[PDB]
Design a protein around this ligand. Structure first.
Ligand SMILES: [Zn+2]
Ligand SMILES: [Zn+2]
Ligand SMILES: [Zn+2]
Ligand SMILES: [Zn+2]
Ligand SMILES: [Zn+2]
Ligand SMILES: [Zn+2]
Ligand SMILES: [Zn+2]
Lengths: 73, 69
């Protein structure tokens, strides 16, 4: 298998999957964008207009090449 | 004071990034501090701080009170 595909945890995928977290935004309660935990979104905002959001602490749209201009770094 | 205290735990799980409203072809983008300075100089940028465990609902910041407290 490719390098980094073993089952020892000292491998790249352990580090790149680690700094992620998920939360919800409720657009029904609004306009300053809020952040809501999963338990509250399911119980406190049942039937509301909700949005799932996943954050990667180190992800950068600029360096990732998703913006109109290429990253200068 | 000793660092083994509640405030150490409550300050730890935070991270910050920038949104560039000038570069709006990617909606709700996330940009690092180095890129916002060198790649988006003069753009309409917004600093955003997030706490992994913060919840506006439980915090009482929304119109209705939280039902899970
Ligand atoms: Zn909550
Ligand atoms: Zn709501
Ligand atoms: Zn950049
Ligand atoms: Zn970047
Ligand atoms: Zn920009
Ligand atoms: Zn976050
Ligand atoms: Zn709640």
């Amino acid at each position: 298998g490719p390098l980094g595909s073993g089952q020892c945890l000292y491998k790249i995928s352990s580090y790149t999957s680690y700094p992620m977290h998920d939360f919800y935004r409720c657009h029904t309660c609004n306009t300053d964008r809020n952040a809501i935990c999963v338990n509250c979104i399911k119980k406190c905002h049942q039937g509301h207009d909700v949005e799932f959001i996943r954050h990667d602490r180190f992800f950068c749209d600029c360096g990732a090449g998703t913006l109109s201009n290429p990253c200068t770094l």
